[PDB]
Amino acid sequence: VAVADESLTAFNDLKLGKKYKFILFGLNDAKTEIVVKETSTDPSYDAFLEKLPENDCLYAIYDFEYEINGKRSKIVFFTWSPDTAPVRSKMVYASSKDALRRALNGVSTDVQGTDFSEVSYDSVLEDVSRG
């Protein structure tokens, strides 16, 4: 599958303009391209977590800001593939991931999310700041 132009534009606007705090991406209906499913300017990490589907897959880019010894920001890429998502969805999202991820320059951190503990604020804060 391919990456929709709109997906790269969204990413550039987040990267260069801080236009969004996060972007959710997903396959279009035809399974032919990765499109933008949702964007948000909400600074609360919970507003991102509450958008993660129980039984479906997605990709996300999150502009994660944190304290250093001022502040720093790192762009985090997520795959979200919960155990209860259909196995065919998990597989098509997995085979299609590189199409999106390879097209994105300036990602600092990659998260492979399969459950809440792997995408929690504390785990991700640990990933961006300490690893």
Resolution (A): 1.9
Where does residue 4 rank: exposed (0-12), middle (13-18), buried (19+ CB within 10 A)? middle
Rounded to an integer, what distance in angstroms lies between the CA atom of residue 60 and that of residue 124?
13
Dihedral class, residue 119 (left if φ above 0, else alpha if ψ from -120 to 50, else beta): alpha
Integer-rounded Cα Rg, in Å, for the chain is: 14
Ordered by where they begin, the domains of the chain are 1-131 (3.40.20.10)
The answer to whether 58 and 25 have CB atoms below 8 angstroms apart is: yes
The answer to whether 76 and 62 have CB atoms below 8 angstroms apart is: yes
SS (H, E, C) the chain: CEECHHHHHHHHHHHHHCCCCEEEEEECCCCCEEEEEEEECCCCHHHHHCCCCCCCCEEEEEEEEEECCCEEEEEEEEEECCCCCCHHHHHHHHHHHHHHHCCCCCCCEEEEECCHHHHCHHHHHHHHHHC
